[PDB]
PDB file of N, CA and C in Angstrom:
ATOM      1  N   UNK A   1       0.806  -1.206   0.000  1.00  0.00           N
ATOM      2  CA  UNK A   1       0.000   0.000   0.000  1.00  0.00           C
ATOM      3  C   UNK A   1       0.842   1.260   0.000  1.00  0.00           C
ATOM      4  N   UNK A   2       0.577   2.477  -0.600  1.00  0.00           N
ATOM      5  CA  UNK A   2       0.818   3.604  -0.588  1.00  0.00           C
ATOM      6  C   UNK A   2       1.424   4.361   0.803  1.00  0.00           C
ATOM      7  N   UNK A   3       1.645   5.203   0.888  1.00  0.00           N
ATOM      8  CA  UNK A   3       2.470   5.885   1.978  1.00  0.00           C
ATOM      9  C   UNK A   3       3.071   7.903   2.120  1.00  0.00           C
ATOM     10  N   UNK A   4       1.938   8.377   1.730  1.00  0.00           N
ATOM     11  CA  UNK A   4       2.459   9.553   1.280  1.00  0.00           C
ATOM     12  C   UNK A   4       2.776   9.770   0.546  1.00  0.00           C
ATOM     13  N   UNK A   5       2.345   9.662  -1.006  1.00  0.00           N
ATOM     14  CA  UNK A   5       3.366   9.770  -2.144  1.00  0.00           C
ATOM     15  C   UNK A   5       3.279  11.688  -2.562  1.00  0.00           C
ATOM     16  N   UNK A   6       2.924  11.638  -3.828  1.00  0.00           N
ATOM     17  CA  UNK A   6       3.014  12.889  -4.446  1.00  0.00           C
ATOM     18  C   UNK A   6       1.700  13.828  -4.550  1.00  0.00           C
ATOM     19  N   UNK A   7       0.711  13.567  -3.395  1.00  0.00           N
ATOM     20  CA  UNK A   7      -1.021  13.982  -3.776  1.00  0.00           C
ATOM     21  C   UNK A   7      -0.663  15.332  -3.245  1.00  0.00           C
ATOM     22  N   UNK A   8      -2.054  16.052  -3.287  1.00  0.00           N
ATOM     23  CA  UNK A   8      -2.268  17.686  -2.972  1.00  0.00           C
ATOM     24  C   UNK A   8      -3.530  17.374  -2.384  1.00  0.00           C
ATOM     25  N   UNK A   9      -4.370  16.510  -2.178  1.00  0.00           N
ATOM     26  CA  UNK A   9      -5.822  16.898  -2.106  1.00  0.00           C
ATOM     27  C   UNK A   9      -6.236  16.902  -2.732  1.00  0.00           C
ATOM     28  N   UNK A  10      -7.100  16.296  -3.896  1.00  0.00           N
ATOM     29  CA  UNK A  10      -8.039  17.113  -4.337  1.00  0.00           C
ATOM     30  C   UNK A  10      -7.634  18.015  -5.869  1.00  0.00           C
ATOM     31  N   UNK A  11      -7.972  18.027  -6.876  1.00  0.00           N
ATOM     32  CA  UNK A  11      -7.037  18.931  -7.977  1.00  0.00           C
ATOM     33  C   UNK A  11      -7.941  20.166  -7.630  1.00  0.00           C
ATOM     34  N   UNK A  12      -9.046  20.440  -7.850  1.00  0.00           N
ATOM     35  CA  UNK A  12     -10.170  21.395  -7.762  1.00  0.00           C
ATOM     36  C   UNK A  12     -11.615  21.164  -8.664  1.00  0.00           C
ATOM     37  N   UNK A  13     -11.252  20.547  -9.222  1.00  0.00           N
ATOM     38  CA  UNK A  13     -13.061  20.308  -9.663  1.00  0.00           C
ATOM     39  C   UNK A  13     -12.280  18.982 -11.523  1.00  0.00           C
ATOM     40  N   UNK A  14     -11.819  19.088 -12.062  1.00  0.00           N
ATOM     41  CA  UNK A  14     -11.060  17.811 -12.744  1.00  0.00           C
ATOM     42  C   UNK A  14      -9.601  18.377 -13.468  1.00  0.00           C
ATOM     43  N   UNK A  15      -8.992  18.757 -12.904  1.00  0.00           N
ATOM     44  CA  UNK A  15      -7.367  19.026 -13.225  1.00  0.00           C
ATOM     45  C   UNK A  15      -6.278  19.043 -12.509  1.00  0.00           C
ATOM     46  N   UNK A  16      -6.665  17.651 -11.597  1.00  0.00           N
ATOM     47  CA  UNK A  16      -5.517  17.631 -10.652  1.00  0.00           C
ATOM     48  C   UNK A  16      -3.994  17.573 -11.088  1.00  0.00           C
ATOM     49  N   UNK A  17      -3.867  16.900 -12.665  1.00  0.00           N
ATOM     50  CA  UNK A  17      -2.608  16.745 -13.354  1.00  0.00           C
ATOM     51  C   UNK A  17      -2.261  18.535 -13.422  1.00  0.00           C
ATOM     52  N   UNK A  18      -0.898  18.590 -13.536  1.00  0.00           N
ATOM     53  CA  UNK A  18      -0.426  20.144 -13.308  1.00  0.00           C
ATOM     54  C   UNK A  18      -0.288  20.237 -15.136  1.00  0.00           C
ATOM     55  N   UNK A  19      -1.239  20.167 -15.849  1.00  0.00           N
ATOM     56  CA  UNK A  19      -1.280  21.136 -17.296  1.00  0.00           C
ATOM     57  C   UNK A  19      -2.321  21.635 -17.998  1.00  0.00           C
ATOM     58  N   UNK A  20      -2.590  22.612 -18.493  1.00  0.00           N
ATOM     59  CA  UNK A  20      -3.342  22.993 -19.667  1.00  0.00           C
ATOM     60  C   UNK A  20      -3.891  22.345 -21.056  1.00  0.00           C
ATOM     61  N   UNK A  21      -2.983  21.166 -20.678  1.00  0.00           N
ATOM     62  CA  UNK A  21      -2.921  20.757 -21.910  1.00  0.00           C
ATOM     63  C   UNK A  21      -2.695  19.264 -22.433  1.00  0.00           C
ATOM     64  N   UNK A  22      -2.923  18.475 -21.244  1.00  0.00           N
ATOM     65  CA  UNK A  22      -2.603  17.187 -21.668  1.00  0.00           C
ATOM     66  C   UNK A  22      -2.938  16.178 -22.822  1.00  0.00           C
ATOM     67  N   UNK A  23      -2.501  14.981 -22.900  1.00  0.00           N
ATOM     68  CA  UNK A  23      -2.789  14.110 -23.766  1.00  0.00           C
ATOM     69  C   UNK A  23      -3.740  13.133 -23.881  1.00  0.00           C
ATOM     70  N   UNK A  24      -4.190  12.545 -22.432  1.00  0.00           N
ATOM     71  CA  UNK A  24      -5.660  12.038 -22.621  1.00  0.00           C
ATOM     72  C   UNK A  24      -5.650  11.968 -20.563  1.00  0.00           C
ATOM     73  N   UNK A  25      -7.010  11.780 -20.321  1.00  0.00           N
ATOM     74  CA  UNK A  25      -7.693  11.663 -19.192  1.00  0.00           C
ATOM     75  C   UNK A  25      -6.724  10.891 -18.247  1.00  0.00           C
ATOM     76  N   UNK A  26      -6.052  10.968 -17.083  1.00  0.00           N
ATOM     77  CA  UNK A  26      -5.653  10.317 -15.978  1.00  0.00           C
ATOM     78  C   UNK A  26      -5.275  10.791 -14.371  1.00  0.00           C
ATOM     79  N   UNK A  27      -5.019  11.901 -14.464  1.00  0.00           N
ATOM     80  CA  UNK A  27      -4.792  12.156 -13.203  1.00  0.00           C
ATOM     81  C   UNK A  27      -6.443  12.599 -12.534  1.00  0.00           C
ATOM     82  N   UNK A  28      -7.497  12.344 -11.934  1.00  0.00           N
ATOM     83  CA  UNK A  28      -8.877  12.987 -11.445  1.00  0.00           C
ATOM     84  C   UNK A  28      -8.471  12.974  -9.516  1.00  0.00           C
ATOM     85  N   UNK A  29      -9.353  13.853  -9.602  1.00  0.00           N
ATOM     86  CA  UNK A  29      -9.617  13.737  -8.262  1.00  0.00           C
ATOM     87  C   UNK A  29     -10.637  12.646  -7.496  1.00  0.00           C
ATOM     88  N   UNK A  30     -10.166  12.041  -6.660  1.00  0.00           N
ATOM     89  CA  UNK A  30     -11.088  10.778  -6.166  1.00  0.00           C
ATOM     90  C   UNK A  30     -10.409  10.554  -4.958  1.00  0.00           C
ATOM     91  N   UNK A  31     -11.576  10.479  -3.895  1.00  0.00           N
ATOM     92  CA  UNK A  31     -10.848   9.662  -2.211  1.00  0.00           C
ATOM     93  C   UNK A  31     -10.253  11.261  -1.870  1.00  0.00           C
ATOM     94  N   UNK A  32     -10.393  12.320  -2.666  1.00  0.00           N
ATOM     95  CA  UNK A  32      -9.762  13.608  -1.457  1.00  0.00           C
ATOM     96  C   UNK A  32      -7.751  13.186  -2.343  1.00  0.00           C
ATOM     97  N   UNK A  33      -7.967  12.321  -3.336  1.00  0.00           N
ATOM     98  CA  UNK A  33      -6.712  12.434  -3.503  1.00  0.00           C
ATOM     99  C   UNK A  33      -6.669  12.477  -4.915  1.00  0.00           C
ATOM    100  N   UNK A  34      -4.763  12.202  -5.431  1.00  0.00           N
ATOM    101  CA  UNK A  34      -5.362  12.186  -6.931  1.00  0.00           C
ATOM    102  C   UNK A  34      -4.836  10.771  -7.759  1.00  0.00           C
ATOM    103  N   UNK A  35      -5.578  10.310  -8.605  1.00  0.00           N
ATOM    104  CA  UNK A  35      -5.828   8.989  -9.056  1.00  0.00           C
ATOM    105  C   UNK A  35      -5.685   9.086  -9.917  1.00  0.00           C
ATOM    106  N   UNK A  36      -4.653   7.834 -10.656  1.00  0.00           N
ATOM    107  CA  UNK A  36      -4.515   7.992 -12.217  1.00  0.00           C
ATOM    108  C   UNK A  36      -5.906   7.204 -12.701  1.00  0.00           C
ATOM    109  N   UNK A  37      -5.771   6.893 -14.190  1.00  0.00           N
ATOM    110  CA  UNK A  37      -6.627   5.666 -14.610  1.00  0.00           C
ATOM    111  C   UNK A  37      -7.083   4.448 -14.658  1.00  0.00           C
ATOM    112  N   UNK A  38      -8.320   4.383 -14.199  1.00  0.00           N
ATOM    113  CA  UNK A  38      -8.671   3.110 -13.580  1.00  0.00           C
ATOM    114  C   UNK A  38     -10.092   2.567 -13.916  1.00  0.00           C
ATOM    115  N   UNK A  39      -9.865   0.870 -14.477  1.00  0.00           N
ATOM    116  CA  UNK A  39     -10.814   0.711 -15.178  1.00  0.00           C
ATOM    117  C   UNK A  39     -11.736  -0.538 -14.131  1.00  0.00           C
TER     118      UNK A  39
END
């Protein structure tokens, strides 16, 4: 299991990844943390 990694909380409503501009859907906010893609 996990241990403190690299989260903030939360991105703010769906852009927790830090760009303007990405390439397809993965970083969201979920659990108060942030979550890549998951099927």
């Amino acid at each position: 299991g996990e241990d403190i990694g690299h989260i903030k909380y939360c991105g703010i409503v769906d852009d927790c990844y830090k760009s303007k501009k990405p390439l397809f859907k993965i970083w969201k906010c979920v659990e108060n943390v942030c979550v890549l893609w998951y099927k």
